[PDB]
Design a protein around this nucleic acid. Structure first.
Ligand SMILES: [Mg+2]
Ligand SMILES: [Mg+2]
Ligand SMILES: [Mg+2]
Ligand SMILES: [Mg+2]
Ligand SMILES: [Mg+2]
Ligand SMILES: [Mg+2]
Ligand SMILES: [Mg+2]
Ligand SMILES: [Mg+2]
Ligand SMILES: [Mg+2]
Ligand SMILES: [Mg+2]
Ligand SMILES: [Mg+2]
Ligand SMILES: [Mg+2]
Ligand SMILES: [Mg+2]
Ligand SMILES: [Mg+2]
Ligand SMILES: [Mg+2]
Ligand SMILES: [Mg+2]
Ligand SMILES: [Mg+2]
Ligand SMILES: [Mg+2]
Ligand SMILES: [Mg+2]
Ligand SMILES: [Mg+2]
Ligand SMILES: [Mg+2]
Ligand SMILES: [Mg+2]
Ligand SMILES: [Mg+2]
Ligand SMILES: [Mg+2]
Ligand SMILES: [Mg+2]
Ligand SMILES: [Mg+2]
Ligand SMILES: [Mg+2]
Ligand SMILES: [Mg+2]
Ligand SMILES: [Mg+2]
Ligand SMILES: [Mg+2]
Ligand SMILES: [Mg+2]
Ligand SMILES: [Mg+2]
Ligand SMILES: [Mg+2]
Ligand SMILES: [Zn+2]
Lengths: 146, 62, 119, 161, 132
RNA sequence: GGGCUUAAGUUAUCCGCCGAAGCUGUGGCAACCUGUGUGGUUGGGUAGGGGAGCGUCGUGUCAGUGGUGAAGCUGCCGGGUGACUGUGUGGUGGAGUUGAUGCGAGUGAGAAUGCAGGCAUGAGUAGCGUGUGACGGGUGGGAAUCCCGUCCGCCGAUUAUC
RNA sequence: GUACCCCGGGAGGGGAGUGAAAGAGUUCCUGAAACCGGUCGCAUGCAAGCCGUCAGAGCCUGUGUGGUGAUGGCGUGCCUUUUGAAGAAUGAGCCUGCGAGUUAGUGAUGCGUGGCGAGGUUAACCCGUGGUGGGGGAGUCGUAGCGAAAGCGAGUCCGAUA
């Protein structure tokens, strides 16, 4: 019988990513991987084994090309003529948490568990966060060679 | 119009459970010699009386 | 020789309604609906018995990847290194090690590293 | 054994309702076979089951049935089973050449062995036959055959080489 | 078979526990309309239940009340329990015989009318059994 | 789809990996052919052809069996490759019926806007068929709806009488 | 065929009696399913569901097997009829019962099997009042074919004894 985690068996850690000059896609892939515990040998798709990810400097996220103006985010209220459009630059300046959360949510399985795990992603546009009681540890986005 | 399909047991019971009443509340007669339950702001069936303990009046000869 | 159908007929109905003994609504009460659902259940279970191999292999591969990336090695390089080293431990036991005996898994990671082409 | 077809059931002459417009299935009669009280489709009708078995086959089968228990030494020949009037007790005692169980008494004619026939009639473990009515079923059914002398004479004279 | 304790209503409703019960069978009222009142009456103290049912506007309050009273009376005769220390431990309504009738509609049509009945069962126990 | 040019884009090349019920491994089953002590090949399937069986009822025979409890129904614990099933074990039930081998079928139902019965859904929903009743007392377990009385209203070429 | 007592206007019930059995109480043998409920265990009020299947925590139970099942993957009913249907093509509200390849020919034509064999077999009918057994060979198929036929015949016909 293959190992399966039991409820609260796997401990969930707190991490803080400094999103200064980090591309939005890189940050979102890394955050989605951390939130779902994909870096752990005790991974299970049905049990939340992921960690808490705090992202600071979310207003300084890097965008390449003309994305800050030409890359659009859409919302619809459901009633006719109820479409709103904004750009990712204006989202990052105005509501960086919403921008980062949209980018991360697009990168997770469309689940009930994923909706629960996205609540662990705390996003702040400034360099400071209020979660010093949880002692988030720094996380560096890095690649493994070959 | 006419129902398109048979309603499921879950939905039928969901709607049907709301067809219900409430229990009548009842209050004790203020008359010491009656002490029987009656409706609030209603004359007592057992003694036909109404009012507080001090100033009682007879509403029904029953 | 007039025969009555009930004694022979109720046997399959009892069987099917026993197989449908957790289903929701008409599927657990009526023989025809339960029969349709048991047809679907048989198709689903035959398909999932074959897909179980791939599902469990995917889970093992993910766990092996996670445990070998903590040692600075990707899964593809780890598997190629174990193939070149001659250690034929399959992904089921590799994942069991990666969860239960992480030191043995890390030693296997070192074995795989030493057996890479390095080119 | 007989049943009634849809034409033999009482009534059912007229169409129950109109072909179109009623919202009901099309019916032509009330005695159609899918109706409660309607006709039976392929139910039994009177028939005879007698088969035209070749004579040689019947004779050979009776021969083999007799031989099976001639080689088993279960065939006995007696002169008679009773003296005088008709007792069942006396020939019941006499048929104890074997156990009184599935015995067949082969006597001659309906008159030459009237006394023997009436004696063995009530034993209920004895099937009594005339020699001219020997058949395979009664021989394969029997555990012993007890011929009377004249019964064996009649059987051997009737059929032989 | 050749086993003891043939099944009985008391063994299934009480089972050697003190208390009693009553059944009103073939009450010419629908089971749902009786249940609308039985749900109110279940679990209550028996005297409170009968006094409340004296004031309940529903038509099913008069049958059910009688049943409760009968149950109480039974408990006062086979068990020696008093009426004021009894509570309605169980209460349920089952369906009885439903008569078929015809109501003539327009255009030569006849619609079906179902006259439903109900069996009302009430089981009363001493108040000390409420938590035990 | 998220997101991607800091390619996760195109392109050439090299090194790995993932990926099916394919192939290999291991453990069962089955059809045909073949030397007849290796085994080989094969086993998706509608119309359709061929082969072999499960269950129901009646029945010859044999062996039985049943109030120390048959049938039927209903649980639990098992069994077979399938129809299915136990000679396991209860409950209910109250008079039949089991196994072997043959014999005969009114022998198997999910559907025909199929037939009969019973019961759901809509739903405590629509309707309760032109309208004027009110009060006092009585009867009664129970009264808006019964009886009596008093007010009031209604028909009156008819809500009258024959 | 339920005396008598209790609640009730009654209906109904509860005690009690008769009975082997009354949960055999006249709606009376057995008493299935749909359907209707009471009780207990688990789950369920952030969730998109052909309602299952595989993976799977937790709880209850543990009669160490069973109930439920958060959560993850996969997953568009059944039948008919179609090139193609989850189909917004047909039919089906549900359950129980019933409802469609049969029977007759000394029919036609095959096959399996048994008997007899250059032969096989009887029909009506007769005897057995005792039946499923015996007789009955009239007929019928095989025994030689070819030709319109006369006819000839291992040949015959078209043909000229080709
Ligand atoms: Mg709804
Ligand atoms: Mg595979
Ligand atoms: Mg006719
Ligand atoms: Mg006609
Ligand atoms: Mg008839
Ligand atoms: Mg009319
Ligand atoms: Mg294969
Ligand atoms: Mg095949
Ligand atoms: Mg076919
Ligand atoms: Mg015996
Ligand atoms: Mg039988
Ligand atoms: Mg048999
Ligand atoms: Mg049939
Ligand atoms: Mg059916
Ligand atoms: Mg039907
Ligand atoms: Mg209803
Ligand atoms: Mg309402
Ligand atoms: Mg409505
Ligand atoms: Mg309304
Ligand atoms: Mg209304
Ligand atoms: Mg008046
Ligand atoms: Mg006037
Ligand atoms: Mg008596
Ligand atoms: Mg019983
Ligand atoms: Mg009955
Ligand atoms: Mg929730
Ligand atoms: Mg979706
Ligand atoms: Mg076709
Ligand atoms: Mg077409
Ligand atoms: Mg449709
Ligand atoms: Mg549809
Ligand atoms: Mg059509
Ligand atoms: Mg329809
Ligand atoms: Zn009072």
């Amino acid at each position: 019988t293959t190992y399966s985690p039991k409820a609260g068996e796997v401990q969930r850690k707190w991490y803080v990513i400094d999103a200064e000059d980090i591309v939005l896609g890189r940050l979102a892939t890394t955050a989605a991987n951390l939130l779902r515990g994909k870096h752990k040998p005790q991974y299970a798709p049905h049990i939340d084994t992921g960690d808490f990810v705090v992202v600071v400097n979310a207003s300084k996220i890097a965008l390449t090309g003309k994305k800050a103006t030409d890359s659009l985010r859409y919302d619809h209220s459901g009633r006719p003529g109820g479409l709103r459009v904004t750009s990712i630059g204006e989202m990052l300046a105005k509501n960086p948490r919403r921008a980062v959360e949209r980018a991360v949510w697009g990168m997770m399985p469309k689940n009930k568990l994923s909706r629960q795990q996205l609540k662990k992603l705390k996003v702040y546009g400034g360099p400071e966060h209020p979660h010093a009681a949880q002692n988030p540890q720094p996380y560096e986005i890095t690649q493994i060679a070959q | 119009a006419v129902p398109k399909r048979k309603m499921s047991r879950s939905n039928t019971r969901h709607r049907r459970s709301q067809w219900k009443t409430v229990a009548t509340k009842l209050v004790t007669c203020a008359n010491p010699a009656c002490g029987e339950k009656h409706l609030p702001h209603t004359a007592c069936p057992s003694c036909g009386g109404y009012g507080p303990r001090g100033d009682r009046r007879q509403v029904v000869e029953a | 020789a007039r025969v009555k159908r009930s004694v022979n007929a109720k046997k399959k109905r009892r069987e099917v309604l026993d197989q449908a003994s957790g289903y929701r609504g008409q599927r657990s009460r009526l023989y025809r609906k339960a029969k349709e659902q048991t047809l679907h259940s048989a198709t689903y279970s035959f398909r999932d018995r074959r897909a179980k191999k791939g599902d469990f292999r995917s889970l093992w591969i993910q766990r092996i990847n996670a445990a070998s990336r903590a040692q600075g090695m990707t899964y593809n390089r780890f598997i190629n290194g174990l193939k070149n080293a001659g250690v034929e431990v399959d992904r089921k036991m590799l994942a069991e090690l990666a969860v239960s005996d992480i030191n043995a898994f890390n030693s296997l990671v070192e074995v795989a590293k030493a057996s890479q082409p390095q080119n | 054994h007989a049943t009634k077809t849809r034409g033999q059931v009482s009534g059912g002459g007229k169409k129950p309702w109109r072909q179109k417009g009623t919202g009901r299935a099309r019916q032509g009669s009330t005695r159609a076979p899918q109706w409660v009280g309607g006709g039976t489709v392929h139910g039994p009708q009177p028939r005879s089951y007698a088969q035209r078995t070749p004579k040689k086959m019947v004779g050979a089968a009776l021969r083999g049935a007799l031989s099976d228990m001639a080689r088993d030494n279960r065939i006995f020949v007696v002169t008679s089973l009773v003296d005088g009037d008709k007792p069942s007790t006396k020939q019941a005692k006499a048929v104890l050449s074997g156990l009184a169980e599935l015995r067949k008494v082969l006597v001659v004619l309906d008159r030459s062995d009237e006394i023997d026939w009436l004696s063995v009639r009530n034993l209920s473990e004895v099937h009594v036959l005339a020699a001219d009515q020997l058949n395979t079923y009664d021989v394969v059914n029997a555990r012993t055959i007890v011929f009377s002398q004249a019964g064996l004479d009649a059987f051997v004279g009737a059929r032989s080489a | 078979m050749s086993k003891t304790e043939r099944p009985s209503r008391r063994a299934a409703l009480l089972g050697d526990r003190p208390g009693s019960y009553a059944i009103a069978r073939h009450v010419r009222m629908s089971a749902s309309k009786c249940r609308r009142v039985i749900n109110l009456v279940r679990g209550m103290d028996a005297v409170d239940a009968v006094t409340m049912l004296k004031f309940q506007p529903q038509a099913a309050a008069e049958p059910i009340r009688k049943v409760i009273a009968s149950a109480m009376a039974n408990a006062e005769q086979t068990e020696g329990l008093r009426a004021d220390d009894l509570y309605i431990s169980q209460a349920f309504v089952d369906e009885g015989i439903t008569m078929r009738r015809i109501r003539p509609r327009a255009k030569g049509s006849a619609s079906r009318i179902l006259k439903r009945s109900a069996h009302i069962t009430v089981v009363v126990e001493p108040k000390e059994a409420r938590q035990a």
